From Swiss-Prot:
From-to range in the entire protein, with total length: 5 to 334 of 956
Highest taxon of source: Eukaryota
Protein name: Kinesin heavy chain isoform 5C
Protein's cellular compartments: Cytoplasm, Cytoskeleton; Cell projection, Dendrite
Family per record: Belongs to the TRAFAC class myosin-kinesin ATPase superfamily. Kinesin family. Kinesin subfamily.
Described function: Microtubule-associated force-producing protein that may play a role in organelle transport. Has ATPase activity. Involved in synaptic transmission. Mediates dendritic trafficking of mRNAs. Required for anterograde axonal transportation of MAPK8IP3/JIP3 which is essential for MAPK8IP3/JIP3 function in axon elongation.
Length: 310
């Protein structure tokens, strides 16, 4: 199909420190896709999502489609890039069990299933999730703490994948939920210590959705990544950063710079529908990063992917 990588920009509101430290709101929103910082040039994306916009609405805006797609046969990835404290974890997962405050992952959980349940008796679906976080170029099963430093490979079709990953099976959004809760717990067994730990730790949630209609025996499938990157502020980022920057404009892409990269390789260069949610801060306290981030999203919006079924 050859469709572009969508990019959305979500701005948190101002925090206490900022609110109390006076500060002020930098971004100016014109149209429903363009943002403006102070005097400078105007940044334009697939959608811009100010503070006031709900998570529900954030969802319909970025995830909702990616989900219908995976169920059609294509792969999908939706990650959140941005400097620490910007909103990534709130937008990717949110308050897990609040029907209002819950982020994307859980909502996708519900959407996937709401969708399946409704389909015909034929074509059964095999959904298996896996969960793991990266830290210093090396992996770590979130569902099996014992294991750390697992590694990647190229399938039959010769494309990469984390191997030896504890793939759990789910039949309802609830399971998917439990599974996430497991991880977040299995994490809490860790000393360096949490807030710190994350900070530079990207967590990956994989949802491998496979279906076959039994009657016609025609199959389908797709991997749907829900990455929540760690801070971007000034090492895999750089890997990432280049891996795309080498995509804006015959060049050769250094996927191999980092596993991560090596992982979402098909999400940046492969038959895969991809969206990016860049989270930003409105306080001038970070006007810098704001430029790099935006700039980062900007570059991405250019990169076009070729995506096919099966």
């Amino acid at each position: 199909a050859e469709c572009s990588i969508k990019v959305m920009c979500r701005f948190r509101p101002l925090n206490e420190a900022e609110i109390l430290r006076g500060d002020k709101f930098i971004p100016k929103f014109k149209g429903e896709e363009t943002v403006v910082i102070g005097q400078g040039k105007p940044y334009v994306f697939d959608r811009v999502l100010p503070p006031n916009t709900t998570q529900e609405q954030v969802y319909n805006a970025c995830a909702k489609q990616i989900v219908k797609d995976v169920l059609e046969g294509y792969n999908g990835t939706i990650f959140a890039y941005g400097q620490t404290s910007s909103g990534k974890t709130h937008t990717m997962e949110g308050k897990l069990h609040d029907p209002q405050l819950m982020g994307i992952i859980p909502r996708i959980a519900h959407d996937i299933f709401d969708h399946i349940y409704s389909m015909d008796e034929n074509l059964e679906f095999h959904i298996k999730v896996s969960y793991f976080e990266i830290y210093l170029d090396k992996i770590r099963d979130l569902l099996d703490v014992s294991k750390t430093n697992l590694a990647v490979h190229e399938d039959k079709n010769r494309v990469p994948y984390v191997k030896g990953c504890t793939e759990r099976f789910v039949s309802s959004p609830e399971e998917v939920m439990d599974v996430i809760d497991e991880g977040k717990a299995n994490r809490h067994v860790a000393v360096t210590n949490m807030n710190e730990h994350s900070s530079r730790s990207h967590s990956i949630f994989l949802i491998n959705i496979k279906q076959e209609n039994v009657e016609t025996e025609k199959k389908l499938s797709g991997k749907l990544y829900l990455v929540d990157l760690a801070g971007s502020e000034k090492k895999s980022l750089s890997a990432l950063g280049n891996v795309i920057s080498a995509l804006a404009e015959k060049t050769h892409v250094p996927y191999r710079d980092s596993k991560m990269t090596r992982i979402l390789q098909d999400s940046l260069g492969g038959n895969c529908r991809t969206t990016i949610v860049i989270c930003c801060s409105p306080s001038v306290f970070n006007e810098a990063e704001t430029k790099s981030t935006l700039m980062f999203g900007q570059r991405a919006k250019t990169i076009k992917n070729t995506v096919s079924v099966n």
